[PDB]
Amino acid sequence: MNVFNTASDEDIKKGLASDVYFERTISAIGDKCNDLRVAMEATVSGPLDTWINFTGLDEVLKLLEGLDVDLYAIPEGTILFPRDANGLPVPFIRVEGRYCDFGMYETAILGFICQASGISTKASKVRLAAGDSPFFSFGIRRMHPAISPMIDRSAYIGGADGVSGILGAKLIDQDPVGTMPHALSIMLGDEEAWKLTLENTKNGQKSVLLIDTYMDEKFAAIKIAEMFDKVDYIRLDTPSSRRGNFEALIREVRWELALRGRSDIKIMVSGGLDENTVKKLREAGAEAFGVGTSISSAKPFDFAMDIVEVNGKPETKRGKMSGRKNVLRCTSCHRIEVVPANVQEKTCICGGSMQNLLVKYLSHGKRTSEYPRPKEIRSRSMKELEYFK
Amino acid sequence: MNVFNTASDEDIKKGLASDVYFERTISAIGDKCNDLRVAMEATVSGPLDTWINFTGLDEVLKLLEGLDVDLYAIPEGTILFPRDANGLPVPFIRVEGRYCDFGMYETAILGFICQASGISTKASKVRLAAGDSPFFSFGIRRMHPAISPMIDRSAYIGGADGVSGILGAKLIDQDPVGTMPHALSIMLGDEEAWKLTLENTKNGQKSVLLIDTYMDEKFAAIKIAEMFDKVDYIRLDTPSSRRGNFEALIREVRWELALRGRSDIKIMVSGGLDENTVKKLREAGAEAFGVGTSISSAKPFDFAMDIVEVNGKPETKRGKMSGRKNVLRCTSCHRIEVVPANVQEKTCICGGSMQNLLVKYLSHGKRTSEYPRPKEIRSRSMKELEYFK
Amino acid sequence: MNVFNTASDEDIKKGLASDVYFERTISAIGDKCNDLRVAMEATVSGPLDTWINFTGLDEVLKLLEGLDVDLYAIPEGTILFPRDANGLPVPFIRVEGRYCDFGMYETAILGFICQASGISTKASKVRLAAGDSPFFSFGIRRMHPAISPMIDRSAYIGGADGVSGILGAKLIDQDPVGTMPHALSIMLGDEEAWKLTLENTKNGQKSVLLIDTYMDEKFAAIKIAEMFDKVDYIRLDTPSSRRGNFEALIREVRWELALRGRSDIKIMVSGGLDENTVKKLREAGAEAFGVGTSISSAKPFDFAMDIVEVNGKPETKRGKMSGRKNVLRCTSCHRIEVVPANVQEKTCICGGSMQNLLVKYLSHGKRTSEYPRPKEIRSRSMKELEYFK
Amino acid sequence: MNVFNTASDEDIKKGLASDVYFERTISAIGDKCNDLRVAMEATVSGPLDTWINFTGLDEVLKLLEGLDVDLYAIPEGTILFPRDANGLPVPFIRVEGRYCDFGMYETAILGFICQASGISTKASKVRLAAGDSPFFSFGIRRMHPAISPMIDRSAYIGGADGVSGILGAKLIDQDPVGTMPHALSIMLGDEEAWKLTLENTKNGQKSVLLIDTYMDEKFAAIKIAEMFDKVDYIRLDTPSSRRGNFEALIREVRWELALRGRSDIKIMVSGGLDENTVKKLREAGAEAFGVGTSISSAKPFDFAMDIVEVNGKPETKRGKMSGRKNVLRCTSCHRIEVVPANVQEKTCICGGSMQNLLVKYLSHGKRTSEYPRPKEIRSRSMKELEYFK
Amino acid sequence: MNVFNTASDEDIKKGLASDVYFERTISAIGDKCNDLRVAMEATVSGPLDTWINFTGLDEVLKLLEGLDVDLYAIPEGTILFPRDANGLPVPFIRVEGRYCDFGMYETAILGFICQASGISTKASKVRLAAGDSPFFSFGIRRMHPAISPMIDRSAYIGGADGVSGILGAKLIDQDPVGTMPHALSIMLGDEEAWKLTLENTKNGQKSVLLIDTYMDEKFAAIKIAEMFDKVDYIRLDTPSSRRGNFEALIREVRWELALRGRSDIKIMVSGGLDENTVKKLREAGAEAFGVGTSISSAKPFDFAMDIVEVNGKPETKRGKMSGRKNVLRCTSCHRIEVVPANVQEKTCICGGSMQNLLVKYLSHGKRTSEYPRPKEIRSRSMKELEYFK
């Protein structure tokens, strides 16, 4: 109940950010509430034709922390398929406790992991495409502002070297990234715009000049070469209508510059990019990418939360597998096997043993460890993305 | 800077929910700030192969209200194509003032209208498919909770008869919608679950029994017919794996019921639906629909905000059209023509005259009128969706 | 001229099962009949984008046996392409004699080999898909009863481990295969149906319980696990409408059983299967398959019979190759070369020599050997199917 | 147990032409047999994207006649969709009695109607394509001889003007159709072949000369025009390899003939034809067609027989609709509605009333009427095919 | 035998521009030459899925004129399908005489009509797309220069309002068309280039300024508007790489101009155009088009010349129709019927009678009339193209 159409932290914590059928069902259950102990697991119904970079668990802990519940989960940043080596649904988080004690949080738990995971996953695919070349999350504009930080966060953990949102950058503990906008060029003109941008380019930061405002990218690049010297990057955001063959243009610009002994000037591109276009543009000569919508508005995974056990006995609905389970992964070839919770480790054909991946983060509402900061998590993600090409 | 990875109203209002290049550019502009008066228009770069149901303007006013700026816009709920009758980009909102006074809000303005409009638009398409049959927004779970209300809001204005989010329902001033979950059936069993659900079904509300938890939809329907009498709806959420031919199953269930003199029991469906599946299921006999992801995670429109004038003179970048403009619509056949702002009305071939559609909502930061509540807006949308089949 | 619309053995033998143009042409030829000695070869016009498992020759001998004619042929069960290594049409059977003496049998000879070969061939493809897992022919129902045995026969020789037709099973000298039908479950109910089926399951035969009649496959499997112990297979015929994701369901059922220490219970599937679905279901966990229509109604090969020689001189029509020929096959890599009948063997590049494959089965109407029983033939087929993956 | 791999009428009547699970289930049921009265309906699971020309019921009566059972059915020759106006499965035959009394005939009943209906239906589609031009069934060769008559029968009832099988022709009470074969031309040569064929062309029968044996169709037609006069048809069976553009060739031949004042000679075509090719060739000038495989080997409909009632109470499996039903058809626009058996007629929006279509053919095993001969049935079919273009 | 690799008029006239097999066959025929009188017709084997605008006959007369031969033909500019109303090949030219007298010209006759007709036909399709807007042939560059005039000729007759080739323009008796090239802009710069172009724009000719050399089309258009006044057209040839959305750019430019009261300036486009792109660009605002390759390099029709009669008797090869014929066309609905040459007129169902279209142009080598100049012919074409949309 604030200014904008959002739900304050207070609200989501009180369970106001949920489907009423929950408080209504809990309520209708009444006195039986106390005698209903369950274990719910979250699995991905969503896209199964792709691996996933798990993200958003941090928020789940910030929510369940305090309730009398045990919470097991796969570490954020982990990368794996939604189905194990044998097509079994893999559980990403498991919650134990009185149904009534946390049931009203089903809506928010899913929300915290669905959208976030789609984002970090898309980022990861873009990471692979970008190679040793840097790319930054720039899409918060195409989404609601209230969540601008969780997006940059996930995008960062997914592989984005930098981020343009103030709040999000603050969240990941890095300086926001950003270059001069077309606005500056329209108000002052390229000449002044560039000059202003070069003068106000501070610290160990690389200078970048937007050149597609008034003139043709090609001649803008020549003019820039013969007018300013210390310029690290040239950025092209070229309007859809002008983008006949972006790849071709990139080569034209790079040739023009080298011919004038300015091959030292690197080329950056932005606007309407994804794994595909980023890979092709890089192969054409781009060394920096600004990725927006494709990441920030990445379709969410379809996570579902289901009671998988009642008062110690395996119980589920149609389409789900009853019983509490663990997720074993080969410390090598990264083969995964979903097994009943009474099986901790196993022998994986490839490099030794299979150890459980589903870690316990909350015991009786108490954090069982200190939660990693974004940098650490993405550091993990990057190691993990190594196994997928 | 709160508990979850979100941006408080305080934050977005201070301009903390934005790309730093803005505060950095404004700043680099310095003293010139005062002498830079501009007019920016927001147009849709996004999908042009579809009309759009504009939404999220309310939030924009809540943000710009107070700054020395004039704001013109198309009323939320309005339905039209992103390109006018002649392929000209239509401006949805226009802002006038000192660039520095509001420039840092570019990120949030877009965010407030991009995602929201995609949502209400998708809802609208589902509305057309649903016909005189009701459908409800149930997808906040598949998205981040912090925005659960703006989603239900837009989904409602787009055509959704009801909504399941507590906060969102509160926002639109309606009771949240909701039926018994599989959870209840798994914990207590159908028999008790149904009984509990029928007893706790209050007020002028229709009873609805979830029947796909344990048994086959078909026999669950027969059993229900011969065990309880006052039951308004039977809900089928049938697991993907079981959904061989949902349409066929719907007929089976309806025939089985009629044969036992219970054709009075209506059928409701939910889970993985959109315009297409909702139209086919309705034709098969469904009279109520619960729509989730397809709406709540609807891809955002790619709105772009561009300076279209500087200190009274038409000025823009490549790919945009300079000058302030008005959006005229035929009070009849609904033909639209984007024209220069010095043209208020015109003669439209079809039913009389073309009147401006772009209304002025803020004058010097002051609201020029009282803002419609959700119900009113959707009431407008529905009239407007009438013109599109 | 019997009860049903079929042709008795008496009839086909008298030449009543044929196109009249034959008896009419023979007749119109008159006295010249005696001086018309020809050699006709049967080749496949039909699908050339697939190999074929020859079948139905046995019936041809039962027909031509007794007439003054020499008959050469490729052994049933042989597997090869319709075109040799050089795209030459391969002759499967060759008949020598007075045109008038056997000409009226052209219709029945083709019929005996066209449909049968399509059947055994389809079975063979299913055999490859089934792997070391058993599958049975169950499709006679989808075809005319009068031929129910020749179908099971061919299906068996093609690779089917068992067969459900009484007559056909008798023909191949094996016990018919069969499990309890939905009918039993509908009349008595699962509980009694299963019990009855387990009690009446005799000899060294595996018990199999149909579980998709009333309840969900998943819970039917659990219930069965906790009610009966000595149950070899669980059969799922799941109705199209319920078969959302058969593969997924198979895993659900297998997991549910293993969790309850009943992974000893094997899973069998049936209904609407072919090479494709059988391969995917097996990979999902199925160890037994019941295949119907796809085999029993397999499209027939388009065999054509053509006079390839008249009174010792090479003679044919357009589209055919004149002269009597032999079909040489490499005793190794199985390369085939159609050559003129005066070439018995040759040197095949790969493993030694190429020996003739076209054997003489009838000399002056007299069988030149004892004809193999079905078991022997399929034993040959299986060796031969080994060369095709 | 006869010479060929077929099942004698004696056999199918004793129930030897069936899946053993039947006699085994009946048997296992024992004494309960007497107290098990059921009603089974046959519906089409098969292709639902096409109407069907029902055929093969005659054989079903010849089988059930004598048993204490009531049999209702839709008249052979009737043409309708497998799903009624509301997507409800339409029952083609219904059988009432003690399950044990007729259960073992499930296999043969389906077989008698599955394959036959596919055949007559395909014929019907070819009928529509052929227009006022005649076409004949010539495909028994591509199928097993034992069933050669039931094929010609169904093909005839489906719309075929004539038939080439001796037995089948006898069955429908018409003279077999037939023209001179390539064999005659290869043995004697065109010149003699034609002469022989013209001389032995008797009664009110049209002469037809096969011309694609040795020479080019074009010149064969010219030669024929200038050598013989009374020749009704010229037949072209042109070998696949020679059939570059059959339609073009047809025009060439027709032009060549007209130029030589012999446009009186009609053109007939044969070999590898179906609805499509027959329609295109007719439009090119063909006035007679010989259709084979496409009809005789037409894929069978997937009919399924299911107990729909036990001892007076509605009972079925998943995927089926319980209760006995009638099939009402509008005596006008031919709209169909499946309704519960206690509803005989109804009011159809279009031309008056909807009368039941499911007639009772057997009462206590006794025929309730005289069964139509093929000619009558096809006479009905043709009236009925009128409603489908 | 001249400088370039071409064949002088002298050469083609001596029969040096042909396949040797001709002079070699004529020669081998020897004395029989005198007694070999034939009639050859030219028909289109080529694309039959399109009508054709006949062209190049003029050249055929210039070649056969003088030989003792009669030549009948369809007038250039005539538009019709290669197959008549009944799929009969339509003869475009017919030649009568001693085979040896003109046989060596088969190669050149085809060449004169094949390529030319493809060109004029493609032009015609572009004409339809261009509407009341002018388009000019500009593609001779993409083809060999020796034929530059016959291309412009055919392109003109096909519908092109103007032509850029000097020789070709001279041939059609019109002034060549042409605008300033990028070359001028690169050497002098836009400013000077435009000025020079406006000053040297003479007579009743419209001024046109190429604007895509250095700057963005958009700003080039604004700059031009505010610097020069009397400028009829602005031409955009926009480089593939820059042509992101040509249609969008066209609107941008037109809006920019109108906003500055210069909507009087028309827009012209060129480079890589055909029916499709010309229709879409016109709908976007283009009023002038320069079409190149698509027309000048239009695939040639596959005309074939065949002896259709020898010494008065109908004679041909396989795939052709013997006898001399006339081509009748309905003076109304333009239905065409190929009929034997002894049929001059006929009754056409639609508007009266069908008159012969195949006119006699040469009698004994003597022109039977004065040949139309290009303007007249295209005047005819345009009337005729009216009947095809």
Side-chain angles (χ1 to χ4, degrees), chain B residues 138-152:
Chain B
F138 285 177
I140 51 174
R141 56 153 44 55
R142 285 120 179 173
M143 290 300 278
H144 187 116
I147 53 162
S148 75
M150 95 76 150
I151 303 185
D152 284 317

Side-chain angles (χ1 to χ4, degrees), chain C residues 1 3 9 170 217 318, chain D residues 1 3 9 170 217 318:
Chain C
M1 301 74 88
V3 196
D9 295 4
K170 177 186 179 182
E217 291 72 16
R318 294 158 59 213
Chain D
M1 301 74 88
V3 196
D9 295 4
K170 177 186 179 182
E217 291 72 16
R318 294 158 59 213

Side-chain angles (χ1 to χ4, degrees), chain E residues 22-327:
Chain E
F22 282 123
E23 58 174 40
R24 288 183 190 176
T25 301
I26 280 176
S27 175
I29 288 173
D31 54 68
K32 288 183 181 172
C33 266
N34 188 61
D35 298 303
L36 279 177
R37 278 201 151 62
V38 301
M40 293 179 82
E41 300 199 323
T43 53
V44 170
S45 306
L48 310 178
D49 66 1
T50 177
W51 37 260
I52 169 180
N53 187 342
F54 195 43
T55 242
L57 200 225
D58 69 311
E59 215 97 302
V60 174
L61 301 184
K62 291 198 180 76
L63 174 59
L64 269 36
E65 162 170 56
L67 303 195
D68 191 43
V69 301
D70 277 352
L71 181 159
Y72 300 81
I74 288 185
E76 287 197 82
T78 310
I79 300 184
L80 70 177
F81 289 96
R83 292 303 135 82
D84 80 326
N86 301 303
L88 294 185
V90 173
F92 289 67
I93 82 92
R94 188 212 307 160
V95 172
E96 286 172 44
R98 296 186 183 67
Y99 182 68
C100 307
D101 285 345
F102 67 86
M104 65 290 281
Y105 294 115
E106 203 187 79
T107 303
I109 294 176
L110 294 182
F112 280 147
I113 62 171
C114 284
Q115 176 162 27
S117 290
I119 293 168
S120 57
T121 293
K122 189 64 171 185
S124 274
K125 289 168 183 306
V126 170
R127 168 74 280 155
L128 293 181
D132 37 41
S133 287
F135 77 99
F136 320 91
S137 184
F138 285 177
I140 51 174
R141 56 153 44 55
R142 285 120 179 173
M143 290 300 278
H144 187 116
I147 53 162
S148 75
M150 95 76 150
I151 303 185
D152 284 317
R153 179 170 180 284
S154 291
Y156 174 63
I157 290 172
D161 302 285
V163 134
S164 68
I166 291 174
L167 292 166
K170 177 186 179 182
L171 202 57
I172 59 171
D173 181 60
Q174 288 283 178
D175 279 306
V177 176
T179 52
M180 59 150 293
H182 302 276
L184 178 63
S185 206
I186 303 174
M187 296 189 277
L188 310 177
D190 290 308
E191 201 122 0
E192 190 61 11
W194 293 325
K195 295 182 178 182
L196 194 60
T197 308
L198 281 171
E199 298 177 297
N200 297 290
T201 197
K202 307 177 294 66
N203 289 296
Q205 204 69 174
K206 267 62 175 60
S207 57
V208 174
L209 289 57
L210 236 194
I211 76 175
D212 66 292
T213 312
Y214 296 113
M215 39 188 90
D216 183 89
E217 291 72 16
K218 190 263 203 59
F219 292 113
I222 285 174
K223 179 168 169 62
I224 284 186
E226 188 56 299
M227 185 175 277
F228 314 71
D229 43 50
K230 181 59 178 59
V231 28
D232 297 288
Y233 292 79
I234 285 301
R235 209 180 82 148
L236 295 61
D237 267 38
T238 314
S240 314
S241 41
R242 305 302 191 281
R243 217 175 289 211
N245 190 306
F246 215 23
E247 283 142 278
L249 181 62
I250 301 289
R251 300 194 184 86
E252 194 178 317
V253 179
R254 278 206 313 148
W255 161 278
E256 235 48 290
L257 287 184
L259 188 65
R260 300 179 181 60
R262 293 294 261 130
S263 58
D264 69 294
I265 313 292
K266 286 169 178 297
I267 288 186
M268 162 177 201
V269 294
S270 172
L273 304 177
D274 60 310
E275 316 87 288
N276 308 308
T277 58
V278 164
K279 178 178 176 298
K280 287 163 203 177
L281 294 176
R282 178 171 54 58
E283 285 164 356
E287 301 174 67
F289 315 76
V291 195
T293 318
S294 61
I295 288 185
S296 60
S297 63
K299 207 68 181 181
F301 275 85
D302 293 349
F303 269 105
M305 211 168 98
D306 299 275
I307 283 180
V308 73
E309 176 182 293
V310 176
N311 302 317
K313 303 183 190 65
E315 283 298 321
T316 53
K317 46 189 266 52
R318 294 158 59 213
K320 298 287 150 53
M321 282 143 55
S322 66
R324 297 181 311 125
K325 343 184 175 64
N326 293 315
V327 192

Side-chain angles (χ1 to χ4, degrees), chain A residues 217-241:
Chain A
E217 291 72 16
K218 190 263 203 59
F219 292 113
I222 285 174
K223 179 168 169 62
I224 284 186
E226 188 56 299
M227 185 175 277
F228 314 71
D229 43 50
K230 181 59 178 59
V231 28
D232 297 288
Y233 292 79
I234 285 301
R235 209 180 82 148
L236 295 61
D237 267 38
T238 314
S240 314
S241 41

Side-chain angles (χ1 to χ4, degrees), chain A residues 1-5 7 9 12 19 21 58-59 62 111 141 143 146 149 164 170 212 217 297 299 318, chain B residues 1-5 7 9 12 19 21 58-59 62 111 141 143 146 149 164 170 212 217 297 299 318:
Chain A
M1 301 74 88
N2 37 78
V3 196
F4 301 117
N5 306 166
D9 295 4
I12 110 80
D19 310 302
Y21 72 77
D58 69 311
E59 215 97 302
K62 291 198 180 76
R141 56 153 44 55
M143 290 300 278
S164 68
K170 177 186 179 182
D212 66 292
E217 291 72 16
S297 63
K299 207 68 181 181
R318 294 158 59 213
Chain B
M1 301 74 88
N2 37 78
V3 196
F4 301 117
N5 306 166
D9 295 4
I12 110 80
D19 310 302
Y21 72 77
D58 69 311
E59 215 97 302
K62 291 198 180 76
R141 56 153 44 55
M143 290 300 278
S164 68
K170 177 186 179 182
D212 66 292
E217 291 72 16
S297 63
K299 207 68 181 181
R318 294 158 59 213

Side-chain angles (χ1 to χ4, degrees), chain C residues 1-7 9 11-13 15-25 28-29 32 36 38 58-59 62-63 99 106-108 110-112 114-115 140-150 153 164-167 170-171 176-179 181-184 186-188 192 196 200 212-215 217 238-239 241-242 293 297-300 302 307 310 315-319, chain D residues 1-7 9 11-13 15-25 28-29 32 36 38 58-59 62-63 99 106-108 110-112 114-115 140-150 153 164-167 170-171 176-179 181-184 186-188 192 196 200 212-215 217 238-239 241-242 293 297-300 302 307 310 315-319:
Chain C
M1 301 74 88
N2 37 78
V3 196
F4 301 117
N5 306 166
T6 56
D9 295 4
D11 294 317
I12 110 80
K13 270 181 172 184
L16 293 174
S18 68
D19 310 302
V20 294
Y21 72 77
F22 282 123
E23 58 174 40
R24 288 183 190 176
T25 301
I29 288 173
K32 288 183 181 172
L36 279 177
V38 301
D58 69 311
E59 215 97 302
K62 291 198 180 76
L63 174 59
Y99 182 68
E106 203 187 79
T107 303
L110 294 182
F112 280 147
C114 284
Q115 176 162 27
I140 51 174
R141 56 153 44 55
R142 285 120 179 173
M143 290 300 278
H144 187 116
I147 53 162
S148 75
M150 95 76 150
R153 179 170 180 284
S164 68
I166 291 174
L167 292 166
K170 177 186 179 182
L171 202 57
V177 176
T179 52
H182 302 276
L184 178 63
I186 303 174
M187 296 189 277
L188 310 177
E192 190 61 11
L196 194 60
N200 297 290
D212 66 292
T213 312
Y214 296 113
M215 39 188 90
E217 291 72 16
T238 314
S241 41
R242 305 302 191 281
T293 318
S297 63
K299 207 68 181 181
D302 293 349
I307 283 180
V310 176
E315 283 298 321
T316 53
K317 46 189 266 52
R318 294 158 59 213
Chain D
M1 301 74 88
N2 37 78
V3 196
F4 301 117
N5 306 166
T6 56
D9 295 4
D11 294 317
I12 110 80
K13 270 181 172 184
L16 293 174
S18 68
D19 310 302
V20 294
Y21 72 77
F22 282 123
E23 58 174 40
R24 288 183 190 176
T25 301
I29 288 173
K32 288 183 181 172
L36 279 177
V38 301
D58 69 311
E59 215 97 302
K62 291 198 180 76
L63 174 59
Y99 182 68
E106 203 187 79
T107 303
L110 294 182
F112 280 147
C114 284
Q115 176 162 27
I140 51 174
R141 56 153 44 55
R142 285 120 179 173
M143 290 300 278
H144 187 116
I147 53 162
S148 75
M150 95 76 150
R153 179 170 180 284
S164 68
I166 291 174
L167 292 166
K170 177 186 179 182
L171 202 57
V177 176
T179 52
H182 302 276
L184 178 63
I186 303 174
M187 296 189 277
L188 310 177
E192 190 61 11
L196 194 60
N200 297 290
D212 66 292
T213 312
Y214 296 113
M215 39 188 90
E217 291 72 16
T238 314
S241 41
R242 305 302 191 281
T293 318
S297 63
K299 207 68 181 181
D302 293 349
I307 283 180
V310 176
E315 283 298 321
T316 53
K317 46 189 266 52
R318 294 158 59 213

Side-chain angles (χ1 to χ4, degrees), chain B residues 162-363:
Chain B
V163 134
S164 68
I166 291 174
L167 292 166
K170 177 186 179 182
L171 202 57
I172 59 171
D173 181 60
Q174 288 283 178
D175 279 306
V177 176
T179 52
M180 59 150 293
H182 302 276
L184 178 63
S185 206
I186 303 174
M187 296 189 277
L188 310 177
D190 290 308
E191 201 122 0
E192 190 61 11
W194 293 325
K195 295 182 178 182
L196 194 60
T197 308
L198 281 171
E199 298 177 297
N200 297 290
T201 197
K202 307 177 294 66
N203 289 296
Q205 204 69 174
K206 267 62 175 60
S207 57
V208 174
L209 289 57
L210 236 194
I211 76 175
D212 66 292
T213 312
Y214 296 113
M215 39 188 90
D216 183 89
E217 291 72 16
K218 190 263 203 59
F219 292 113
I222 285 174
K223 179 168 169 62
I224 284 186
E226 188 56 299
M227 185 175 277
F228 314 71
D229 43 50
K230 181 59 178 59
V231 28
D232 297 288
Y233 292 79
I234 285 301
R235 209 180 82 148
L236 295 61
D237 267 38
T238 314
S240 314
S241 41
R242 305 302 191 281
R243 217 175 289 211
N245 190 306
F246 215 23
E247 283 142 278
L249 181 62
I250 301 289
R251 300 194 184 86
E252 194 178 317
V253 179
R254 278 206 313 148
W255 161 278
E256 235 48 290
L257 287 184
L259 188 65
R260 300 179 181 60
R262 293 294 261 130
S263 58
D264 69 294
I265 313 292
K266 286 169 178 297
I267 288 186
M268 162 177 201
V269 294
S270 172
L273 304 177
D274 60 310
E275 316 87 288
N276 308 308
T277 58
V278 164
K279 178 178 176 298
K280 287 163 203 177
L281 294 176
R282 178 171 54 58
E283 285 164 356
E287 301 174 67
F289 315 76
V291 195
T293 318
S294 61
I295 288 185
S296 60
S297 63
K299 207 68 181 181
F301 275 85
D302 293 349
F303 269 105
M305 211 168 98
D306 299 275
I307 283 180
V308 73
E309 176 182 293
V310 176
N311 302 317
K313 303 183 190 65
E315 283 298 321
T316 53
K317 46 189 266 52
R318 294 158 59 213
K320 298 287 150 53
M321 282 143 55
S322 66
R324 297 181 311 125
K325 343 184 175 64
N326 293 315
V327 192
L328 282 51
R329 180 160 77 177
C330 205
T331 55
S332 306
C333 60
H334 281 193
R335 173 163 190 285
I336 282 186
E337 278 192 55
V338 174
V339 302
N342 67 62
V343 169
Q344 302 309 300
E345 44 183 298
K346 185 186 189 64
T347 305
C348 158
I349 52 178
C350 101
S353 68
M354 274 179 288
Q355 298 311 310
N356 191 178
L357 199 73
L358 200 59
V359 164
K360 176 192 274 192
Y361 281 77
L362 293 185
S363 194

